[PDB]
Design a protein around this ligand. Structure first.
Ligand code: CHL
Ligand code: CLA
Ligand code: CLA
Ligand code: CLA
Ligand code: CLA
Ligand code: CLA
Ligand SMILES: CC(/C=C/C=C(C)/C=C/[C@@]12O[C@]1(C)C[C@@H](O)CC2(C)C)=C\C=C\C=C(C)\C=C\C=C(C)\C=C\[C@@]12O[C@]1(C)C[C@@H](O)CC2(C)C
Ligand SMILES: CC1=C(/C=C/C(C)=C/C=C/C(C)=C/C=C/C=C(C)/C=C/C=C(C)/C=C/C2=C(C)C(=O)[C@@H](O)CC2(C)C)C(C)(C)C[C@H](O)C1=O
Ligand SMILES: CC1=C[C@H](O)CC(C)(C)[C@H]1/C=C/C(C)=C/C=C/C(C)=C/C=C/C=C(C)/C=C/C=C(C)/C=C/C1=C(C)C[C@H](O)CC1(C)C
Ligand SMILES: CC1=C[C@H](O)CC(C)(C)[C@H]1/C=C/C(C)=C/C=C/C(C)=C/C=C/C=C(C)/C=C/C=C(C)/C=C/C1=C(C)C[C@H](O)CC1(C)C
Ligand SMILES: CC1=C[C@H](O)CC(C)(C)[C@H]1/C=C/C(C)=C/C=C/C(C)=C/C=C/C=C(C)/C=C/C=C(C)/C=C/C1=C(C)C[C@H](O)CC1(C)C
Ligand SMILES: CCCCCCCCCCCCO[C@@H]1O[C@H](CO)[C@@H](O[C@H]2O[C@H](CO)[C@@H](O)[C@H](O)[C@H]2O)[C@H](O)[C@H]1O
Lengths: 219, 231, 165, 41, 221, 207
């Protein structure tokens, strides 16, 4: 209720209240008015945040190591093409189809979990592994096989805090990936290169001087 | 009371029943209307009084002992036994400690009255802005008259320091040097004799301080205080 | 080449058209001074014409036998030959903006329909409410899909008036 | 003042202002980005 | 009752202007503040405009005085271009974006205070940023924000008479500064010189240096 | 209030007298959550003890490298230990360290999850448990008396060692030579050599 809001002084919408992690009453477009739609958007936000976290990690950590000298990998925008010209390189179409085939199975199963959390725990569904496919009651947080170390299982408040940390990190990584895309499209350089170039001359090296963000027609 | 900064006037409401030393009912802007602000300003005035007294006395003694050294440019023309960087750092650290203790003592009376190293020694109870104890081992006379003397001398010292800096920026000489110059020609050495403005013309005395001063390897501004606003 | 069309970059008719237009503009310009207002206006028109032709040739547009750009309106055909910006992308852009305006109007009408006097709200628009709904209409695809999957985007046929056959 | 703002919120006034704003925005888009035959992004 | 912007004539004085507001003289011939919320918004805008005009006029006057004395301080009508010239490493768009962002943060804080009088005096801010109210009988928020940061000297804390006197001083000086900025713009557009330049040229030669001799106000002359 | 006579104890540290070196220092309120404070106490003990061992090792190695006592192995900077050659390469030593540390750290984590549980070795040997962060490895029985004073000494020395290691790393990244050499270079004047003139910390001064 009285938790911090995105815009101090503005009352949070009634459709948001304060139970979902990362609930800051931010919904100027009123996209989550419907309960079913809000649940689907919550699951989508969790999935997008986790994938963005994995991608941003795989883009920043290797780049940071490469800058130091240990572990030499190409820039993220050229990583796909670098592997294409390899000797025993798998065809792009075949690789994409294999990835999509595996993702079809896992994503469809997760989809059924979203409609009904205890769906995948149906006895006899698998070869005895369905017992570990029962969620925690909320779609998007499946214990059992996942979460093997049992982090946050000490109490309900401990799990809530970890959920907030996860949602904030996911949102930060999502915004970071969008920034990576825009930065590479505007400037054909890596994220670390952009950061180093900006600190050298912040007033002369930023989005206002890349020649893409601000159209040249206006000036 | 009968001692008023404007005889025949009336003390302001907030300055009535004012027990502060040297309180002559002077507050046209009402800066001391608030009680808390009045105490804070009293502490600020006392510290300014003491600092100005020390500065004026030091400048006068330096000029008497060393008349060939300009007090205005002494910061860059004295030849320091140590280094300017180390000296500034040491002064900043010790000043931070003492000033923080004093300010916190003002915010909370008896919070900063105990010796942190020697637990047996403690400053006795006192009034804000007047430590005492080890700070006042000799008191020649009553505390009230001495307090009034301190406040009056401090105010005079502040005015003296402002006069010193203005005379140095206008004449470029030391305090006693400017006084001697004024004594040799009172009708020609006053501010009214060097500056005058009329609807059509304005005479502004030239700056006696260089535009910039070179210290070590860098350059320091050090010019005139609002020369464009000079009469 | 898609349907016997030649790229405007290698089209002779396209270059001839540009040359003729610039020639006509210069012929008109010859009857003026060098720094007068009509001369500057004609020079600006010439520059704009040259820039337009160069941009059309550089953008990869397809020109026919007549030397004029032609648009490919077919997904797949335009996607594999690099012509998605001819009709595909403009289709997406339109659909989005059109749906935005339509959804904003629908939401405003449904919101004022619950007021005690809706006709007056229709002739005298509520500027703050209209502004808020116009802003909310930008998320029209998500809202429309949610309402459709929710069943609230439609009215029951048994509740809509109909003619006596 | 309330009546004046209510009059400015009428269907004809709002329609003309909206059309004028949209036309002005389109005119300036075409002034700074002229001859946009295709969506070249 | 109180002094009016036009002696006598109580018909032109609006009813909503009862004299409770600071600087109220019954001036509103066009009825731009007839509505209550419109009047509150206009009060906020007027005080903000006055403070902004005072700051701008003070800066312009000081820069013009420094320019006359020989300092490397350009005129107000060319200060931006001059600064951009001496600093070729500062992008204009970057400076504009930074100014807009910082001003947007503070302006959003003030805006939320306008929407909710006492909503910014908590969270990431102490109770000092809650406001003291004043206009429309409010006791919180408004253009008058007390506290220990927007009033460190505490001039409005203690004796309501002093507070009223200072408020009147502020509004009168703000209106005067607004008119002064308008005059600065008109004088620069007519003569092409700064404020101090116009003042000294006029004092040097009173007659022959009026608005009629600038060649812009009176075209045929 | 212990760390600042003008400050107030952040409440969550007022009723905690069993914590070593409790001076009410937590301006960021990081230890407000009891579980967070419980984890932070163990983290502080681990970091402090490791910092004490590391700082002592760096200081002893540099002392032997400067004065001259250790062989060719000691005659080298602490950050240049990679140039030396030992019985096993860097990769082998790193892998061995990872395995041994995995074993020891997992034992410590098991104890943290349930204090007093993992206290018996595979051969049946047992020890007496005395608080979480203090397993009881006291072969000299020094904790029989004045346990609070001893742990206070440990926490203060640990914090000092942590600060010392941070300073050593910063000096190495800003000044050349070993920590003892930096101390000597300072003591040489010492009004000129003091991070202000190093040309790295101020940055704004002489680029
Ligand atoms: C605390 C009071 C104090 C006062 C009143 C002064 C006053 C002065 N100092 Mg000094 N100083 C003071 C403390 C100290 N100075 C120095 C070190 C120097 C140096 C090295 C120099 C001065 C100079 C000056 C003069 C600069 C004139 C001007 O317009 O500068 C404009 C003001 C600035 C450029 C600084 C603005 C920021 C600052 C207030 C912080 C001036 C008379 C300069 C001089 O000789 O000028 C002729 C000079 O070169 N001072 C140290 C370090 C030991 C101080 C420590 O407390
Ligand atoms: C609106 C009607 C329409 C029409 C008349 C066409 C017609 C055509 N399409 Mg097409 N298409 C359409 C809609 C349409 N499309 C839409 C809505 C999409 C988006 C899903 C596509 C996406 C698409 C792709 C990806 C491709 C075509 C292709 C083609 C061409 C050969 C395919 C074919 O017809 O073989 C027979 C069709 C059977 C169903 C059998 C052909 C001229 C192919 C092409 O580019 O030609 C080389 C191609 O690969 N289309
Ligand atoms: C359905 C009919 C139709 C369509 C599809 C088009 C399409 C187009 N016209 Mg055209 N036009 C039409 C009817 C049409 N027109 C009619 C009836 C007339 C007579 C008045 C004209 C007269 C005309 C002229 C004189 C010109 C065009 C131009 C253009 C092109 C410019 C695109 C643009 O504005 O940039 C992009 C605009 C945006 C990205 C804005 C999108 C966002 C808006 C604000 C949303 C609006 C929400 C409501 C474009 C391909 C210009 C051109 O250069 O031709 C190539 C041009 O000079 N038209
Ligand atoms: C933008 C600055 C500004 C604003 C927002 C206000 C706002 C207000 N004034 Mg104020 N005033 C101003 C400037 C301003 N004033 C200046 C510069 C003067 C000195 C001449 C005065 C002198 C004055 C007096 C004597 C009184 C007020 C009063 C009021 C209040 C009631 C009037 C009202 O509701 O109409 C709102 C006003 C506006 C919405 C501004 C409209 C501006 C129009 C639309 C533009 C035309 C202005 C100008 C003629 C053209 C020049 C522009 C061009 C050269 C670029 C109100 C809160 C009365 C009061 O009760 O005080 C509380 C009152 O007695 N004002
Ligand atoms: C407690 C930490 C510690 C550690 C980890 C080491 C580790 C090492 N020491 Mg050292 N040493 C230490 C403390 C330590 N020392 C102290 C406190 C002293 C002073 C009493 C010495 C005095 C010392 C000497 C004089 C020498 C070593 C040498 C060595 C290296 C080979 C040792 C050997 O095989 O025997 C010796 C091998 C010989 C061929 C002789 C080795 C990496 C030897 C070395 O540098 O290798 C060439 C060597 O000469 N140490
Ligand atoms: C753990 C206590 C400790 C001690 C005893 C020293 C002692 C020393 N330091 Mg060091 N330092 C420390 C912590 C410490 N430092 C920490 C935590 C940092 C990280 C901010 C640094 C970063 C640092 C730098 C960058 C430099 C020194 C330098 C020095 C030497 C000159 C004095 C000086 O400028 O120090 C500065 C003290 C600090 C920056 C903070 C000290 C923390 C408090 C005040 C300790 C009490 C000196 C022998 C300088 C040197 O190498 O000499 C040429 C030098 O350039 N120190
Ligand atoms: C805010 C303002 C000026 C601010 C200026 C600034 C910040 C200047 C900034 C800078 O200069 C510096 C410092 C340095 C330079 O190098 C750069 C710039 C950037 C240029 C003036 C407002 C100026 C505002 C003015 C003059 C307003 C006048 C309004 C009037 C007279 C209205 C009267 C009536 O509205 C009533 C009250 C009642 C109605 O019913 C009837 C009528 C008659 C309509
Ligand atoms: C004040 C104010 C309003 C403002 C509202 C705004 C504005 C909000 C802004 C959001 C963002 C995020 C703006 C980004 C704002 C950022 C920028 C950069 C804006 C403009 C910059 C331009 C046009 C210059 C471009 C150049 C060209 C093309 C060249 O050629 C090269 O030299 C390089 C270069 C010099 C950069 C208000 C409505 C509240 C109320 C009043 O109405 C007023
Ligand atoms: C909330 C709201 C509500 C209201 O009402 C309205 C509004 C305002 C609208 C809103 C907002 C929204 C937003 C902001 C959104 C965004 C999102 C994002 C950004 C996402 C991303 C997301 C993102 C993501 C997933 C990403 C991911 C990534 C990845 C995987 C990566 C990958 C990779 C790698 C590793 C490497 C290589 O070499 C390359 C690649 C291949 C590339
Ligand atoms: C009360 C009131 C109230 C009402 O109501 C209003 C009004 C009017 C506002 C008011 C008044 C006010 C005033 C008058 C003020 C002033 C002050 C001052 C002057 C200060 C100074 C002050 C001053 C000061 C401190 C000073 C100090 C000084 C010094 C330290 C010095 C030092 C030095 C020396 C030794 C030597 C060397 O070689 C140099 C130097 C370094 C330089
Ligand atoms: C309390 C609080 C609370 C509030 O509220 C807030 C705040 C303020 C944030 C806070 C504070 C904090 C802090 C200060 C922290 C810090 C820490 C540290 C420094 C650690 C270290 C730590 C450190 C450490 C572990 C270290 C260790 C070391 C070592 C092992 C070493 C090793 C080594 C050696 C021997 C030798 C060779 O040749 C090299 C090497 C191999 C390298
Ligand atoms: C009752 C009717 C209204 C009465 C008041 C009308 C006054 C309004 C402005 C009148 C001025 C405009 O008309 C203006 O007349 C003056 C004066 O002759 C002309 O000025 C001309 O004659 C004057 C002197 O006679 C010369 O110094 C000048 O060089 C020449 O240009 C202007 O070229 C014309 O623009």
């Amino acid at each position: 209720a009285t938790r911090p809001l995105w815009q101090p002084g503005v009352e949070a919408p009634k459709h948001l209240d304060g139970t979902m992690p990362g609930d800051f009453g931010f919904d100027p477009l009123n996209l989550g008015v419907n309960k079913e739609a809000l649940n689907w958007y919550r699951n989508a936000e969790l999935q997008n945040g986790r994938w963005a976290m994995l991608g941003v990690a795989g883009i920043v950590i290797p780049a940071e190591l490469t800058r130091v000298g240990v572990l030499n990998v190409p820039e993220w925008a050229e990583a796909g093409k670098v592997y294409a010209e390899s000797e025993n390189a798998i065809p792009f179409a075949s690789l994409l189809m294999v990835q999509l085939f595996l993702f079809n199975f896992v994503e469809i199963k997760r989809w059924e979990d979203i409609k009904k959390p205890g769906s995948q725990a149906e006895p006899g569904s698998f070869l005895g592994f369905e017992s570990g496919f029962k969620g925690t009651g909320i779609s998007g947080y499946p214990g059992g096989a996942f979460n093997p170390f049992g982090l946050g299982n000490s109490s309900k408040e401990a799990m809530d805090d970890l959920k907030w940390r996860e949602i904030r990190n996911g949102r930060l990584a999502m915004v970071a990936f969008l920034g990576f895309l825009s930065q590479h499209a505007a400037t054909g350089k890596g994220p670390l290169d952009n950061l180093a170039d900006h600190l050298a001359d912040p007033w002369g090296a930023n989005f206002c001087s890349n020649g893409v963000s601000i159209p040249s027609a206006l000036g | 009371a009968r001692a008023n900064w404007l005889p025949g006037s009336d003390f302001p409401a907030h300055l009535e029943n004012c027990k502060l030393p040297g309180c002559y009912g002077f507050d046209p802007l009402g800066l001391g209307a608030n009680e808390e602000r009045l105490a804070w300003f009293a502490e600020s005035e006392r510290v300014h009084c003491r600092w100005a007294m020390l500065g004026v006395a030091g400048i006068l003694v330096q000029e008497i002992v060393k008349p060939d050294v300009f007090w205005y440019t002494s910061g860059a023309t004295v030849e320091l036994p140590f280094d300017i960087t180390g000296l500034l750092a040491f002064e900043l650290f010790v000043m931070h400690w003492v000033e923080s203790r004093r300010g916190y003592d003002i915010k909370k009376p008896g919070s900063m009255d105990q010796d942190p190293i020697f637990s047996n020694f403690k400053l006795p109870a006192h009034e804000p802005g007047y430590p005492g104890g080890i700070f006042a081992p000799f008191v020649p006379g009553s505390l009230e008259e001495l307090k009034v003397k301190e406040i009056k001398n401090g105010r005079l010292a502040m005015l003296a320091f402002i006069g010193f800096t203005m005379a140095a920026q206008v004449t470029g000489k030391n305090p006693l040097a400017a006084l001697r110059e004024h004594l040799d020609n009172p009708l020609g050495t006053t501010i009214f004799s060097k500056a005058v403005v009329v609807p059509g013309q304005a005479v502004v005395p030239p700056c006696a301080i260089p535009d910039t001063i070179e210290f070590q390897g860098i350059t320091i501004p050090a010019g005139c205080f609002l020369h464009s606003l000079w009469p | 080449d898609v349907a016997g069309l030649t790229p405007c970059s290698e089209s002779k008719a396209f270059a001839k058209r540009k040359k003729n237009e610039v020639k006509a503009l210069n012929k008109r310009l010859k009857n003026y001074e060098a720094d007068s207002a009509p001369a500057l206006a004609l020079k600006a028109t010439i520059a704009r014409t040259e820039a337009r032709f160069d941009k059309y040739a550089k953008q990869g547009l397809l020109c026919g036998t007549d030397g004029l750009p032609h648009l490919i309106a077919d997904p797949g055909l335009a996607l594999r030959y690099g012509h998605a910006g001819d009709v595909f992308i403009p289709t997406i852009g339109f659909i989005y903006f059109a749906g935005w305006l339509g959804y904003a109007g629908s939401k405003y009408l449904q919101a004022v329909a619950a007021t005690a006097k809706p006709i007056e709200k229709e002739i005298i628009i509520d500027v703050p409410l209209a502004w808020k709904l116009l802003w909310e209409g930008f998320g029209w695809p998500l809202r429309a899909f949610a309402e459709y999957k929710n069943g609230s985007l439609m009215e029951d046929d048994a509740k809509i008036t109909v003619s006596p056959r | 003042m309330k009546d004046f703002t209510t009059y400015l919120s009428t269907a004809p006034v709002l329609t003309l202002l909206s059309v004028t704003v949209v036309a002005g925005l389109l005119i300036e888009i075409n002034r700074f980005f002229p001859d946009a035959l295709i969506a070249a992004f | 009752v109180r002094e009016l912007w036009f002696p006598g004539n109580k018909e032109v004085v609006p009813d909503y202007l009862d004299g409770s507001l600071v600087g109220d003289h019954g001036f509103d011939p066009l009825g731009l503040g007839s509505s209550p919320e419109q009047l509150s918004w206009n009060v906020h805008a007027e005080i903000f405009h006055g403070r902004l005009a005072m700051t701008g006029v003070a800066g312009i006057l000081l820069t013009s005085l420094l320019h006359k004395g020989g300092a490397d301080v350009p005129e107000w009508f060319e200060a931006g271009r001059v600064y951009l010239d001496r600093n070729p490493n500062v992008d204009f768009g970057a400076l504009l974006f930074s100014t807009i962002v910082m001003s947007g943060f503070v302006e959003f804080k003030r805006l939320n205070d306008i929407r909710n009088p006492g909503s910014q005096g908590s969270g990431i801010l102490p109770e000092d940023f809650k406001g003291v109210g004043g206009p429309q009988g409010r006791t919180v928020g408004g253009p008058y924000v007390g506290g220990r940061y927007f009033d460190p000297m505490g001039l409005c804390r203690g004796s309501p008479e002093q507070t009223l006197k200072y408020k009147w001083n502020e509004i009168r000086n703000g209106r005067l500064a607004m008119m002064a900025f308008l005059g600065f713009a008109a004088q620069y557009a007519a003569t092409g010189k700064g404020p101090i330049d116009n003042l000294v040229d006029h004092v040097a030669d009173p007659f022959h240096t009026t608005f009629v001799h600038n060649g812009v106000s009176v075209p045929f002359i | 209030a212990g760390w600042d006579l003008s400050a107030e104890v952040p409440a969550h540290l007022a009723g905690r007298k069993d914590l070593a070196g409790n001076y009410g220092f937590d301006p960021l309120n990081l230890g407000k959550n009891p579980e967070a404070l419980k984890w932070y106490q163990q983290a502080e003990l681990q970091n402090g003890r490791w910092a004490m061992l590391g700082v002592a090792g760096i200081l002893v190695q540099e002392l032997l490298h400067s004065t001259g006592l250790g062989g060719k192995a000691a005659d080298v900077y602490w950050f240049d230990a990679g140039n030396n050659t030992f019985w096993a390469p860097k990769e082998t030593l790193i892998a061995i360290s990872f395995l041994m540390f995995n074993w020891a750290e997992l034992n410590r984590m098991q104890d943290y999850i349930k204090p007093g549980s993992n206290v018996t070795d595979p051969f049946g040997n047992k020890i007496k448990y005395v608080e979480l962060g203090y397993p009881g490895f006291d072969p000299l029985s020094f904790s029989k008396n004045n346990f609070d004073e001893w742990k206070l000494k440990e926490i203060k020395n640990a914090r000092l060692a942590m600060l010392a290691f941070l300073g050593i790393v910063a000096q190495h990244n800003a000044q050349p030579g070993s920590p003892l050499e930096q101390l000597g270079a300072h003591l040489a004047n010492p009004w000129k050599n003091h991070f202000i003139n190093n040309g790295v910390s101020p940055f704004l001064t002489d680029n």
